[PDB]
RNA sequence: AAACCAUAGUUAUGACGAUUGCUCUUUCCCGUGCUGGAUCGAGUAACCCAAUGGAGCUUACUAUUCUUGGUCCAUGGAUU
RNA sequence: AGUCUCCCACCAAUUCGUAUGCGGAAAACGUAAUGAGAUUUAAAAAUAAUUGUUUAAAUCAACUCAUUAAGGAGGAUGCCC
C-alpha cells in the first residue's frame, strides 16, 4: 500500500481518558511564558522547523514524538499529504501519533495549527512513551511492499 | 480469455507496473519516471476504471514525473525542500528546478 | 531443400481401418523418397466436409508419427507433417475447423463449386487451395480473385503425380494446370506429387522437365519448390503452434532448432520446451567476447 | 440520314534470325587508374495490358526473378 | 490498372463578378516559411477513392490541420565590400 493502511494508524480505546490529561499537560506547558514553555520540554510548533529538524540538522536524541490532528474534514489535506513519509525517512525514530477524536480541535485553537513534535527524552515523556510503544507502532515504506496500491 | 483469469491478470499487470514505477530509475531518472508514468496511465485508461482522488492529488510530479518524497531500503528523496507557507504552501524537488504550490 | 506436401494416406473416412500392407507400402515409398534425395515430406489425409466429424481430439489424427514414423525416422533422417484436405461442395452447417486446424498442422481445401470456392478463398482459414485435376474445373477461373488470395495468403497446388494414374486423365490434368498457371500469374504455385506407391515417384529433374513442358519456367519452379514450399510450411506451422504470429514457443539458437525443423524436441501434447538454463545475467553481452 | 473521326485504334499489335549497348563474375595488357580493349558465360526483368482525348492524386513493380543516385543522433571492423 | 476529381457552348452576372501564400482555366491539384497536435485529440485506433503490410507515437523522415494579398518608397541589422 501507499496510503491505504495510512488510514488505519491507531488501534486502542484506552486512549481518551489519558489523552485529555495530556492536553492538561499541554496547558501546563503553554501557560508559563514564551520561553518557559520550551524551558523544560523541547516543543516545536512551526511547519518550517518541523521539517528542518527532521531534515537531518541535529541527531542528538533518537526518540522523537510527533503529533498531528487529522482523519477529519476541515483540515489541510495538502499538508497531510506528505508528513508520514517525512517522519519515516528521517533517521530519528519518530513515532507519529494522530489525535483519535475530531472534537479535540482545541489543539488547533491553542498552539498554532494542530502540529507538534517533541524530543522525547524527559522522564515523564519516556515515562509514558514506554507505555505508548506498548500501544501502537505502524510505519512502513511504500517502495517495499507496493502490492496493494488500490485494486478493486 | 476467461473473465475470472482476465481480472486477475489485470490486477497483476497493475501491480507490476506500479512496482516498476518505484525502485531505482523512476526515482532517479526523470525520463524513465515520465515514461513509466505515461505507460501506467495509458494502461489504466484502457480499462476505464476511476482512480482514487486521495492519492491522485499528491501522487507525482507534473514537470518530470517523480514521486513527491521528502527526507529497510535506503533510497533517494524526491522533494528537497518543503517550506512553510511564507505566503502559501509550496513543494520543490531535485530532479528538475520547478515547484508546485497549493493554497490552504 | 526439396519439399513434397501431397503424400496421400490410404484412408478417406474414419470408418476405415488401415491394414499393415498400406503402412508398409508407405514406409517403402518414404524410404524410396529418402534414397534418391528429399528434405521435407508432409503426408495428406483427405476427408469430406459434409459428414459428421467425431467429437474427439486424441482420435482425430490417425497418423501416429511418434510410434512408427518416430521409429523409422532415426534410420531415415527426415521429418513428417500431417495435412488434411477439406473437400467442400455446398455450404452445409457442419463446420468445426477450430479443432481440426489445431490438431493438424496444414489444412487445405478441394472445392468443387463456385460458392464453396469463394467462401474458402475469403473466409475459410486454410493454407493451400487444391483443385480436382481428375474432374473438370467448376467454372472459368478469374485473375483478380486468385491474385488477391495469393497476396492474402493461400496459394494454388499443382499435383503432377496424378497424371501417372490413367490415360484419359492426362488431358484434363493439362487443361486444368495450364488454366491455373494462366489465372494465377505464376506467383503462388506449389507443386506436389500425389503418389500412393514408390512406383510413380520421380527425380527433381523429371519434375522440372514436366513443369517446363507444361508452361512454367524452370527457375521459377526451383524457386517455388525451395522457398515457397518452406514458407507455406512455416505458415501452417506457426498459425497452429504459435499464436497469430506474435509469440513463438520455439527458440532457434543456431541453425538447426527451428519451429519447422526441430520436431522431436518441441513437445506436442503441450507447447512447452524444457531446456536447461543457458541464459543468465552475469555473462558478457558481446557474443564474440563471451567465452565459456 | 448522316455527323466516321487517331503520326496504335475496338480488345489486332503475330513467327523467328542477326547486331550494338548495360549488371556482376573468369583472365590478359600498357602507366595505379581511365563510360579502355578482347574473349568464357548468365541476365535484359517484375507490375500488368489500351477501347474517345488531356491534366492532377493515390495504389502495384524491380531477392542467383535487368538497374541507377543520395541519405541515415542504424549497427559491425580499423586509424587518429 | 483503380467504385477518385475536373475541362471538353456562352453569359459587366439570381451565371460560386473568388484582387485571399505561390503556379494553374478548373481540380475531393503541386509546393514553400512558422507553431502545435495523438481514440486524455480539430480529426486516423485497442466498446469520396485506394492500399497484403496501410501516418507518427528516442531523434530524424511521413500525414493532417491552423496563419502568411500583388507591386513601388524610407529606416535598422547581418555578409563581400
Ligand atoms: Mg481498361
Ligand atoms: Zn521536475
From Swiss-Prot, chain A:
Protein task: Required for processing of 5.8S rRNA (short form) at site A3 and for 5'- and 3'-processing of pre-tRNA.
Identification of the protein by name: Ribonucleases P/MRP protein subunit POP3
Keywords: Nucleus, rRNA processing, tRNA processing
Transmembrane regions listed in the UniProt entry: none
Subunit composition and interactions: Component of nuclear RNase P and RNase MRP complexes. RNase P consists of an RNA moiety and at least 9 protein subunits including POP1, POP3, POP4, POP5, POP6, POP7, POP8, RPP1 and RPR2. RNase MRP complex consists of an RNA moiety and at least 10 protein subunits including POP1, POP3, POP4, POP5, POP6, POP7, POP8, RMP1, RPP1 and SNM1, many of which are shared with the RNase P complex.
Family statement drawn from the similarity comment of this UniProt entry: Belongs to the POP3 family.
Localization per Swiss-Prot or TrEMBL: Nucleus
GO annotation terms (biological process): intronic box C/D snoRNA processing; maturation of 5.8S rRNA; nuclear-transcribed mRNA catabolic process, RNase MRP-dependent; rRNA processing; tRNA 5'-leader removal; tRNA processing
Main location, first listed in the record: nucleus
Note: Present with 1360 molecules/cell in log phase SD medium.
Assigned GO CC terms: cytosol; nucleolar ribonuclease P complex; nucleus; ribonuclease MRP complex
From Swiss-Prot, chain B:
Keyword terms: Hydrolase, Nuclease, Nucleus, RNA-binding, rRNA processing
Main location: nucleus
A GO biological-process term: rRNA processing
GO cellular component, one term: ribonuclease MRP complex
Compartment(s) where it occurs, according to its Swiss-Prot or TrEMBL record: Nucleus
GO MF, any single term: rRNA primary transcript binding
Oligomeric and partner information: Component of RNase MRP complex which consists of an RNA moiety and at least 10 protein subunits including POP1, POP3, POP4, POP5, POP6, POP7, POP8, RMP1, RPP1 and SNM1, many of which are shared with the RNase P complex.
Function: Essential component of the MRP ribonucleoprotein endoribonuclease that cleaves mitochondrial primer RNA sequences.
Other remarks in the entry: Present with 172 molecules/cell in log phase SD medium.
Name the record gives this protein: Ribonuclease MRP protein subunit SNM1
Provenance organism: Saccharomyces cerevisiae (strain ATCC 204508 / S288c)
Residues of the full protein shown: 1 to 117 of 198
UniProtKB/Swiss-Prot annotation, chain C:
Main localization (coarse): nucleus
GO biological process terms on file: intronic box C/D snoRNA processing; maturation of 5.8S rRNA; nuclear-transcribed mRNA catabolic process, RNase MRP-dependent; rRNA processing; tRNA 5'-leader removal; tRNA processing
Keywords: Hydrolase, Nucleus, rRNA processing, tRNA processing
UniProt EC number: 3.1.26.5
GO cellular component assignments: cytosol; nucleolar ribonuclease P complex; nucleus; ribonuclease MRP complex
Catalysed reactions, as listed in the record: Endonucleolytic cleavage of RNA, removing 5'-extranucleotides from tRNA precursor
InterPro entries: Pol/histidinol_Pase-like, RNase_P_p30
GO molecular function: ribonuclease P activity; RNA binding
Leading EC class: hydrolase
Function statement: Component of ribonuclease P, a protein complex that generates mature tRNA molecules by cleaving their 5'-ends. Also a component of RNase MRP, which cleaves pre-rRNA sequences.
Record-stated family: Belongs to the eukaryotic/archaeal RNase P protein component 3 family.
Additional detail: Present with 6300 molecules/cell in log phase SD medium.
Protein name: Ribonuclease P/MRP protein subunit RPP1
Phylogenetic lineage: Eukaryota, Fungi, Dikarya, Ascomycota, Saccharomycotina
Amino acid at each position: 500500500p501507499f496510503t491505504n493502511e495510512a488510514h488505519m494508524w491507531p488501534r486502542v480505546h484506552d486512549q481518551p481518558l489519558i489523552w485529555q490529561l495530556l492536553q492538561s499537560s499541554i496547558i501546563n506547558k503553554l501557560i508559563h511564558i514564551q520561553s518557559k514553555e520550551n524551558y523544560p520540554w523541547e516543543l516545536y510548533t512551526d511547519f518550517n522547523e518541523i521539517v528542518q529538524y527532521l531534515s537531518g540538522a541535529h541527531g542528538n536524541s533518537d526518540p522523537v514524538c510527533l503529533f498531528v490532528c487529522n482523519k477529519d474534514p476541515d483540515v489541510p489535506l495538502v499538508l497531510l499529504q506528505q508528513i508520514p513519509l517525512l517522519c519515516y525517512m528521517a533517521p530519528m525514530t519518530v513515532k507519529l501519533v494522530q489525535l483519535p477524536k475530531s472534537a479535540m480541535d482545541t489543539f488547533k485553537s491553542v498552539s498554532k495549527y494542530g502540529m507538534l513534535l517533541l524530543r522525547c527524552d524527559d522522564r515523564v515523556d519516556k515515562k509514558f512513551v514506554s507505555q505508548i510503544q506498548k500501544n501502537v507502532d505502524l510505519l512502513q515504506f511504500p517502495w517495499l511492499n507496493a502490492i496493494k496500491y488500490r485494486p478493486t | 480469455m476467461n473473465k475470472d483469469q482476465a481480472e486477475k491478470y489485470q490486477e497483476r499487470s497493475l501491480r507490476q507496473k506500479y512496482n516498476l514505477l518505484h525502485v531505482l530509475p523512476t526515482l532517479n531518472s526523470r525520463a524513465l519516471s515520465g515514461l513509466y508514468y505515461k505507460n501506467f496511465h495509458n494502461s489504466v485508461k484502457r480499462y476505464q476504471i476511476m482512480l482514487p482522488e486521495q492519492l491522485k492529488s499528491g501522487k507525482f510530479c507534473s514537470h518530470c514525473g517523480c514521486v513527491y518524497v521528502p527526507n529497510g531500503d535506503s533510497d533517494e528523496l524526491g522533494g528537497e525542500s518543503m517550506e512553510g507557507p511564507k505566503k502559501c504552501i509550496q513543494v520543490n524537488c531535485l530532479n528538475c528546478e520547478k515547484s508546485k504550490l497549493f493554497e490552504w | 531443400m526439396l519439399v513434397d506436401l501431397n503424400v496421400p494416406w490410404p484412408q478417406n473416412s474414419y470408418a476405415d481401418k488401415v491394414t499393415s500392407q498400406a503402412v508398409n507400402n508407405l514406409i517403402k515409398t518414404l524410404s524410396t523418397l529418402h534414397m534418391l534425395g528429399y528434405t521435407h515430406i508432409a503426408i495428406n489425409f483427405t476427408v469430406n466436409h459434409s459428414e459428421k466429424f467425431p467429437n474427439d481430439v486424441k482420435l482425430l489424427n490417425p497418423i501416429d508419427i511418434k510410434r512408427r514414423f518416430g521409429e523409422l525416422m532415426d534410420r531415415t533422417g527426415l521429418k513428417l507433417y500431417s495435412r488434411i484436405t477439406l473437400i467442400i461442395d455446398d455450404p452445409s452447417k457442419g463446420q468445426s475447423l477450430s479443432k481440426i486446424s489445431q490438431a493438424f498442422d496444414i489444412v487445405a481445401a478441394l472445392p468443387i463449386s463456385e460458392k464453396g470456392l469463394t467462401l474458402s478463398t475469403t473466409n475459410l482459414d486454410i493454407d493451400l487451395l487444391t483443385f480436382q485435376y481428375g474432374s473438370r474445373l467448376p467454372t472459368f477461373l478469374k485473375h483478380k480473385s486468385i491474385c488477391s488470395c495469393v497476396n492474402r495468403g493461400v496459394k494454388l497446388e499443382i499435383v503432377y503425380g496424378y497424371a501417372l494414374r490413367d490415360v484419359q486423365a492426362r488431358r484434363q490434368f493439362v487443361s486444368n494446370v495450364r488454366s491455373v498457371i494462366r489465372s494465377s500469374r505464376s506467383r503462388g504455385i506449389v507443386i506436389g506429387s500425389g503418389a500412393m506407391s514408390p512406383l510413380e515417384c520421380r527425380n527433381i529433374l523429371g519434375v522440372t522437365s514436366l513443369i517446363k513442358n507444361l508452361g512454367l519456367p524452370s527457375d521459377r519452379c526451383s524457386k517455388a519448390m525451395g522457398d515457397l514450399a518452406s514458407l507455406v510450411l512455416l505458415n501452417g506451422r506457426l498459425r497452429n503452434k504459435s499464436h497469430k504470429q506474435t509469440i513463438v514457443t520455439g527458440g532457434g539458437s543456431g541453425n538447426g532448432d527451428d519451429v519447422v525443423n526441430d520436431v522431436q524436441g518441441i513437445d506436442d501434447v503441450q507447447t512447452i520446451k524444457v531446456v536447461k538454463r543457458s541464459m543468465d545475467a552475469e555473462q558478457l553481452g558481446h557474443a564474440s567476447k563471451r567465452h565459456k
